[PDB]
Amino acid sequence: AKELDATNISIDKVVGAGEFGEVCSGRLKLPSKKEISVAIKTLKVGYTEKQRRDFLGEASIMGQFDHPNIIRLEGVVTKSKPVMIVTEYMENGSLDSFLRKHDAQFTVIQLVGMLRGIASGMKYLSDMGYVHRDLAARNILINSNLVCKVSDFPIRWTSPEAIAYRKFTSASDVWSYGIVLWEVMSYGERPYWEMSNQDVIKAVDEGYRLPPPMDCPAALYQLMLDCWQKDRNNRPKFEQIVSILDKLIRNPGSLKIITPSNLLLD
């Protein structure tokens, strides 16, 4: 993490509440004098040394990644207070809340573009040996041009083997990605709705899966089912997912084929 000079940071408005303090939007002046929009997280006054370590830990992890679909760390402020993390700004906020405002208003190709971006970011994360463990639409940010980026460095999003015995792998992230795919095509519906956690676990283990979202292309529902294979070795790798979505983008016509209990037994 680059140490930023605090005189280069302006804080304009509060846009959210974080675990360790406020989230704000603002501006950062780069060494080149270019001014960019940024998000700013501040560590709350009177922090404990553990809180400081956990706070800055996110920056340490995020700083290892340089990719168009991973939130960009601009730097940190530690030598003055409040302590701060500064990232690129994403005008349209969290993906799930954004889609909920626009139910059925985007084209399939727009949605597939979002999904391809998320998959590309995950492909790089997994390439780097990072298992996210919290991949969910609420942890994806989306900017003014609808570019989606992985952020946040959860039973409904977690693979059965990770729930069963903490077997977290890039293949359990692929499971989570399948859930994100369902979330996106459902415009931010909650996975498994408000089912009791114990029933989500039992149903999924028994082979039940989320149903196809309204007007969901068959190709995309099949990709969900592939991400949700019980045997994690049968799930696609993220490189394959990116390839699949790139084909659908290249062949928009294929997206026109559309797909007892709420959940379906696969």
Ligand SMILES: COc1cccc(-n2c(N)c(C(N)=O)c3nc4ccccc4nc32)c1
């Ligand atoms: C500045 O440090 C970080 C680290 C991780 C995520 C974010 N982060 C951003 N870059 C955001 C943005 N809109 O650009 C944003 N909106 C948020 C809204 C609500 C809660 C947390 C948020 N968190 C946010 C900011």
